Design a binder for this molecule. Structure first.
Ligand SMILES: [Br-]
Ligand SMILES: [Br-]
Ligand SMILES: [Cl-]
Ligand SMILES: [Cl-]
Lengths: 82, 83
């Protein structure tokens, strides 16, 4: 219908969450590398971890869930009037 | 050492995520009420859904994960002497 069902809301949130999760996994992988490294290697790994976090925060400020919720509100607002 | 391990990061994300997940469940439950209601009951339920969404977006702008990552960044920047 006009307003998402719970299942439709969840499936929309998933679509948006998919690329964010992929980016997050790359951060996790880099974090392990930092802890497994020592000396100059650890310094290098840490700088790259910093960039990955920066890049993630810039590209993914809003969760998949929150993006879908914003769309749900508009559906509800329209179903009610404004 | 001075920065989270992957396990510690996941643990911290989960703590922050817990209240957000609870508010979200409230929205999900109210959305089911909207679809289960007929006529006048559906209108009332929709107003309350809108309020719940509105309150959530004000209360929970940043995911548990993102809150934990922001703390991680600060640890890493501190460790490397960056601002
Ligand atoms: Br997220
Ligand atoms: Br979230
Ligand atoms: Cl997400
Ligand atoms: Cl969350």
């Amino acid at each position: 219908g006009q307003i998402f069902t719970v299942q439709e809301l969840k499936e929309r949130a998933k679509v948006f969450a998919k690329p964010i999760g992929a980016s997050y996994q790359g951060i996790l992988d880099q974090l392990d590398l930092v802890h497994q490294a020592k000396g100059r290697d650890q310094i290098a790994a840490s700088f790259e971890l910093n960039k990955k976090i920066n890049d993630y925060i810039a590209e993914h400020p809003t969760s998949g869930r929150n993006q879908a919720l914003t769309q749900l509100k508009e559906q509800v607002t329209s179903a009610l009037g404004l």
